[PDB]
Amino acid sequence: NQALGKKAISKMLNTCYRILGLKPTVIFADQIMYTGFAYAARSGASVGI
Amino acid sequence: ARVTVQDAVEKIGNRFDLVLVAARRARQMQVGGKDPLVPEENDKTTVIALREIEEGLINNQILDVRERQEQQEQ
């Protein structure tokens, strides 16, 4: 429930490792990277003048 | 297939001795004169030995007593 600005996501990965384990956080990181790529493509972010 | 070996790490905890144990078991199952104690899923002997370690039926002590038993048999 935040903006997830490259610091909350790293914190969430650290908490997932410290609380759950190694396989769940590996799967979580893979899913995060998948969904980040997918929704970055969906958003269509672009830089203009 | 085993993506991560954390269960094998926690079965006997060194992250270093498990390499030796799994290498010994893989040698036993690869050079011959041994069959896997866990169902074989067409994967290589390395992960078969690792899965045997993870499921708890392969460790140093029982490997040594198996060596002794086959030594006394012959």
Give the torsion sign (CA, B56, B61, B65, B70): positive
Half-sphere exposure of A46 (CA within 13 A, CB side): 4
Token couple for A44: 């269509």
Quickly tell me which residue has 């997932």 as its tokens.
Answer: A16
Cβ-Cβ contacts under 8 Å, B5 against chain A: none
Q: Do residue A22 and residue B3 have CB atoms under 8 angstroms apart?
A: no
Check if A45 contacts B (Cβ < 8 Å).
Answer: no
A46 φψ region: left (φ > 0), alpha (ψ -120 to 50), beta (else): beta
Distance CA A49, CA A27 (A): 39
Resolution (angstroms) equals 3.5
Token couple for A25: 């956080």
Return all residues near B24 (Cβ < 8 A) that are at least 6 apart: B63
Check if A24 contacts B (Cβ < 8 Å).
Answer: no
Calculate how close chain A gets to B35, using CA atoms only, in Å.
29
Distance CA A20, CA A12 (A): 11
**Would you call B29 exposed, middle or buried from its count of C-beta atoms within 10 A (0-12, 13-18, 19+)?**
buried
Residue among B20, B57, B4, B8 at smallest CA distance from B35:
B57
Give the torsion sign (CA, B33, B38, B42, B46): negative
Interface residue ranges in chain B relative to chain A, Cβ cutoff 8 Å: 3-4, 6
Cβ-Cβ contacts under 8 Å, B4 against chain A: 22-23, 26
Return all residues near B45 (Cβ < 8 A) that are at least 6 apart: B26, B29, B30, B36
Distance CA A44, CA B41 (A): 44
Q: Do residue A22 and residue B6 have CB atoms under 8 angstroms apart?
A: yes
Under DSSP, the state recorded for B61 is H
